[PDB]
Amino acid sequence: EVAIKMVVVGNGAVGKSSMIQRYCKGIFTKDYKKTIGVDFLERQIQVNDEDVRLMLWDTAGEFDTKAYRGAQACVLVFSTTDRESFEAVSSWREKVVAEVGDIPTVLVQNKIDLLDDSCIKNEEAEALAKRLKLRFYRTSVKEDLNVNEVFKYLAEKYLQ
Ligand SMILES: Nc1nc2c(ncn2[C@@H]2O[C@H](COP(=O)(O)OP(=O)(O)NP(=O)(O)O)[C@@H](O)[C@H]2O)c(=O)[nH]1
Numbered sequence: 001e002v003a004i005k006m007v008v009v010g011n012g013a014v015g016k017s018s019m020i021q022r023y024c025k026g027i028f029t030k031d032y033k034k035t036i037g038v039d040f041l042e043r044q045i046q047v048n049d050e051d052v053r054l055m056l057w058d059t060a061g062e063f064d065t066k067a068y069r070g071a072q073a074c075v076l077v078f079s080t081t082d083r084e085s086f087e088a089v090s091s092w093r094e095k096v097v098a099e100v101g102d103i104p105t106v107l108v109q110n111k112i113d114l115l116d117d118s119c120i121k122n123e124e125a126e127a128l129a130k131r132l133k134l135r136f137y138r139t140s141v142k143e144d145l146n147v148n149e150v151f152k153y154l155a156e157k158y159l160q
């Protein structure tokens with residue numbers, strides 16, 4: 001079994017806790033203040049004929065921890081409806097690279113189901129991903145869209 005520690009990072013309310021709950025528990029609650037009462041949730045999947053245990057560590061939205069220590073892959077999340085969360089993506093990337101290193105990382109635009117209230121142009125987000133040289137996914141945690149693909153990509157890149 002290959003165990004992979006992954007950190008989910010991004011500005012407040014972009015959907016980090018919901019993303020981890022969706023992937024590891026298959027739920028999306030109407031909870032007001034969503035919280036994961038433990039350090040990480042996990043999901044054990046088969047990836048390219050191998051047993052993989054993905055351990056997903058939650059973080060706070062606290063820019064200067066045990067979550068980052070030893071991280072082996074990273075999900076950078078911003079929100080379709082939060083302009084500042086998009087503009088903060090480069091800084092979150094620098095924080096992970098400086099504190100952990102150049103680990104496999106995916107850029108995620110969450111809340112794509114709220115596209116009517118979008119404040120990020122498609123060209124803007126794609127151009128950012130190309131500048132940072134990061135795989136880019138548009139996800140909806142609420143509708144379970146492209147969440148599985150994000151973590152499967154990171155697992156595969158850590159293995160290969
Ligand atoms: N419409 C929609 N709402 C979403 C989606 N993902 C999360 N949310 C909602 O956005 C809110 C914030 O989500 P949450 O997971 O708490 O975000 P967070 O990044 O963990 N916040 P914090 O940094 O404060 O811990 C919640 O009301 C949650 O239900 C999504 O894909 N679509």
Ligand SMILES: [Mg+2]
Pocket residue numbers: 016017018034035058059
């Ligand atoms: Mg949270």
